[PDB]
Design a protein around this nucleic acid. Structure first.
Ligand code: NA
Length: 90
RNA sequence: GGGGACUGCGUUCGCGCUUUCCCC
């Protein structure tokens, strides 16, 4: 497909001094056939935040690695919201 | 029996699994 602009809203998390979580909006250029996992790769390259630590949400949907951006009907200027994933357990 | 930190993960976002531990 044709590459589109996808935005990622990064958290503002200054206590995470190992990453660059400064509230910025990342702007990536990717085709709509690219999988959501590619967004995590590019977020890792820009913030240092590993993919396994990223929680992505698009229009309230917890988008999954194996689906393409087109699967979620993303378009130019779509904003993906990034959060820190927190693990649980008993 | 509670809370944390991790290593990876899953998730319906409620948490759950796991890995090293650390405490109360
Ligand atoms: Na719900």
């Amino acid at each position: 497909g044709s590459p589109v602009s996808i935005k990622v809203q990064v958290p503002n998390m200054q206590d995470k001094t190992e990453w660059k979580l400064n509230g910025q909006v990342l702007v990536f250029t990717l085709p709509l056939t690219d999988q959501v996992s590619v967004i995590k790769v590019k977020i890792h390259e820009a913030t240092g935040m590993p993919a396994g630590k990223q929680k992505l949400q698009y229009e309230g949907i917890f988008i999954k690695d194996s689906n393409s951006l087109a699967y979620y009907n993303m378009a130019n200027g779509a904003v993906i919201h990034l959060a820190l994933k927190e693990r649980g357990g008993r």
